[PDB]
Amino acid sequence: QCASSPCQNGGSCKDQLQSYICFCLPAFEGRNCETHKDDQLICVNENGGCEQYCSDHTGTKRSCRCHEGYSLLADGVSCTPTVEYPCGKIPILE
Amino acid sequence: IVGGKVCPKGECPWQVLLLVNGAQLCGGTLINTIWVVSAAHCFDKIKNWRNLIAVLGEHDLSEHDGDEQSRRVAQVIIPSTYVPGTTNHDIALLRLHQPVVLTDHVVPLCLPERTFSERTLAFVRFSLVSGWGQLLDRGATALELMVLNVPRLMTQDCLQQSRKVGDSPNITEYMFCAGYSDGSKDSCKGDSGGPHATHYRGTWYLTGIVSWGQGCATVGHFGVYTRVSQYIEWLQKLMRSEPRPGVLLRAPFP
Amino acid sequence: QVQLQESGPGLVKPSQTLSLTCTVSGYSISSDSAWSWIRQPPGKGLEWIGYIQYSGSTNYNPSLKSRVTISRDTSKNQFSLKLSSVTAADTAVYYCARSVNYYGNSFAVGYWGQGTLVTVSSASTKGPSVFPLAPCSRSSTAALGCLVKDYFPEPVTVSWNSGALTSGVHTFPAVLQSSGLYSLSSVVTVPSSSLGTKTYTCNVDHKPSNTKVDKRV
Amino acid sequence: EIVLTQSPATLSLSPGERATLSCRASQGISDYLHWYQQKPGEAPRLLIKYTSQPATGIPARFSGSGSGTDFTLTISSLEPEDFAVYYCQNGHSFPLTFGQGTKLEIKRTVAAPSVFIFPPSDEQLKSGTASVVCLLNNFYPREAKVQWKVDNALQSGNSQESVTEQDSKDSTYSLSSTLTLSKADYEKHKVYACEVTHQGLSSPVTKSFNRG
Amino acid sequence: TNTVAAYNLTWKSTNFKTILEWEPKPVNQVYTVQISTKSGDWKSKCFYTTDTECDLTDEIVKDVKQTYLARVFSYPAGNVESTGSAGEPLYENSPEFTPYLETNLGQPTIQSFEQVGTKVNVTVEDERTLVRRNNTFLSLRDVFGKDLIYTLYYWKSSSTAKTNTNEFLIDGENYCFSVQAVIPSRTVNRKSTDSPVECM
Ligand SMILES: [Ca+2]
Ligand SMILES: [Ca+2]
């Protein structure tokens, strides 16, 4: 009962009574694996996968900022301190 | 602070101790070198503003180590939508006469952006509160700094779990409950103005201010904290303004 | 009323140390401020060398952090800079400035100094000789000026009649002569009627050489 | 390090128009951006702080907007005193970085220049050098050419031209031309004159002087 | 009121494919789903979708024994973002779900069955679950452990077997075997559906 092409994007189906479970690769999720887990870099999704700050642009990919006194590294997701005494960080723990 | 553990010296550096005429008044949170944030209900019963002093780097109220710093506060700012004797709009911004010297035991706590606090920090369960309040309900003020780990709950889930209270003040959009309902851990009164710090990837942010915990360690009740996500735009507009001579300025909200 | 001014030699040989001193009058260094040194080459490429705030803590630009040291003495109300291993690229006008709206992490720059030009070269200091410029025909309006020929470096300022007249004064930017030596001329415009009674003099000052020649036209 | 780019490099607008200046940042620095104006020979002035708030004493004509990567500086009713190079400063993270600078040359009504010629001073000849200076004082625009013909002969190797910045009152330029020749060569000719051509002049007028 | 509140939230998990399903179909509104563990951290999923189902399988498989709790928001069409004197979004909680016990057991498939004479041996294949370890799907045997006991029924057109392993040994005619999955350590959903019947 799975000949209706239910699985999408390389999924594998398993027969169930009036149901159809799709066994998909880790890159996709859903009942029919119709969700592109890689193509969801929106700022509401876990802060857009960024450490401190992010700014969701209209069409293009999200841009990530940092708090005052912090400059982002070349990776675009992490922020490093610039002043001698940064904010929100305990100096005795380093 | 009830049910917590002693916060090691230097692990809670953004906390400040507010003393009026050499007496314990309230806690506070240092956000930058000039401005400090605490509760607003602490200043209802005060009329001599010259002797208001903030102590930074203090850990043990009995011993005087070299890390302690004290600066005079020359201005206190409260929102215009706050009437004394009410829990709503319980936030106050204070300006020190002179800045503090940042040391290993004195570092400020970042004030998050409104969008960042409303979407990312608001969904972290365990945020920590600290203060010098009574260690036991209606007991004795602690000699050492006490830190407490409390869970954050939304107002909708918070209202149904509340026990039968004689008077339940409305929890507006500027406040949120946080704590445990079993009476083990709660936010006391003596630690009001303490930092409800939230952690996100190696950085600490201020997300709430302890205002009223319905007393202390009350069974079937939580500790309502003031939401700071609703004041970031209001705080920064006057934080960068000129030093008006008014010691207590009723700045218009928002 | 807070004002600040920098004091320096005006010329530092390459492969040596550059030193500048800035004095503050209307404000205390140890109350609330961050004090920075900002330089601008002749290309006007504003560069932030570094800053020192109150209590003595310092932070420098990582581009040149290995050859810069900034110190201060609270008693004398002044803070200085020490930049070593200066090259030709360090020839710039260094501005002393104070930070406004300084809340720790970063600040602005509200108060600025007058700026002192520093020339890095392996040459010698030469004082200038002023030559008058007067019209050849005695007649509505006439022009007169002064010529400055042999001076190096180029912090040369020309004032007319000790500031009595300021309208019509045009101190042209210095042009390097074919020999590599700077030369400038300052010209003023005055009515032809006041050419027999009023005395027009140009006050040329060359601070590195400490030569002051007052010649009238 | 935050690399800050300022565009356009050069802008020429009339007083009756409005000038728009752009300040793009390599990262999102929020509103932590301050604007400066640097008139030539003077230190920069803080015009607008944090991209929206103007300073004290700043005329209301200046304004700003933008947040994040792109920032704009606006001069609503431009005036002849606005000639300066404007800068925007990074004010969020270190290293503190300023802009490259956008020169703002102003336009005005066509002018008729004034040309004067000065013989070298007799005291100057004592040092074995002679220099004759021909100057323009109130000429606009700056697109002018000066041709120096000495005793019906033209030189092309010793001419030096120096031009001042736009003045703040009437927005008129000033040009000084000096050609330095040996004092012996100064005794080889008899009449030295400078030919000045300009759009404001109907014909190129030449001012000369005779020996003695 | 800005939006309507979610209601009738139900969990549908078969062979560990956990899907949170809830009505009503959106009417000028959108939904957003968050899932978290007990005193853990709320993770958001299904952002601003108009569907009536959210796949939370990738989150419940991290800790098969931990109890998960989920909630569904209802954002409006005009104030889906921004503040405008912002309050808290309307939402509704989901019933507590434990993937190790509350999930339904999938329909088993018989692997092989042979006749050697006086004894017949029925073998059951190791069904793959949805607990993603590395890049391979964990099997039923290696997830539930030793608590899955299989039951077999056999008949020869004129008519129960129990075993603790994944193989059956019983004592010709054509025998029709049906296998069934059941774990006795469950208070709810103890048994599964019967496998397809295949004779000799
Ligand atoms: Ca102490
Ligand atoms: Ca003219």
Residue numbers in the entry:
A (entry chain D): 49 to 142
B (entry chain C): 153 to 406
C (entry chain B): 1 to 139, 143 to 220
D (entry chain A): 1 to 212
E (entry chain E): 4 to 162, 167 to 178, 182 to 210
Copy text verbatim from the article accompanying this structure deposition:
Here we describe HMB-001, a bispecific antibody designed to bind and accumulate endogenous FVIIa and deliver it to sites of vascular injury by targeting it to the TREM (triggering receptor expressed on myeloid cells)-like transcript-1 (TLT-1) receptor that is selectively expressed on activated platelets.
The anti-FVIIa arm of HMB-001 was selected based on the absence of effects on FVIIa-dependent thrombin generation and normal inhibition of FVIIa by antithrombin (AT). The crystal structure of the anti-FVIIa Fab in complex with the active site-inhibited FVIIa:sTF complex showed that the anti-FVIIa arm of HMB-001 recognizes an epitope on FVIIa composed of residues from the epidermal growth factor-like 2 and protease domains of FVIIa. The binding epitope does not overlap with the active site of FVIIa, the binding interface with TF or the N-terminal γ-carboxyglutamic acid (Gla) domain of FVIIa that is involved in membrane binding. A comparison to the published molecular model of the FVIIa:sTF:activated FX (FXa) complex further suggests that the epitope is distinct from the predicted binding site of FX/FXa, consistent with functional studies. Structural studies revealed that HMB-001 engages FVIIa at an epitope distant from known physiologically important surface patches, providing a rationale for the observed lack of effect in non-cell-based functional studies. HMB-001 did not affect FVII autoactivation or FX activation by TF-bound FVIIa but slightly enhanced FX activation by FVIIa in the absence of TF. HMB-001 bound to FVIIa, zymogen FVII and sTLT-1 with equilibrium dissociation constant (KD) values of 0.37, 0.4 and 2.3 nM, respectively. HMB-001 binds equally well to FVII and FVIIa, providing a rationale for the accumulation of total FVII(a) observed in cynomolgus monkeys. By using the two crystal structures, a model of the ternary complex among HMB-001, FVIIa and TLT-1 receptor embedded in the phospholipid membrane was generated. Consistent with the two crystal structures and available functional data, the generated model supports the lack of interference of HMB-001 with the known functional properties of FVIIa and TLT-1. In addition, the orientation of the HMB-001:FVIIa complex with respect to the HMB-001:TLT-1 receptor complex and the fragment crystallizable (Fc) domain of HMB-001 allows HMB-001 to simultaneously engage with FVIIa and TLT-1, while the FVIIa N-terminal Gla domain is free to dock in an apparent productive orientation on the phospholipid membrane surface.
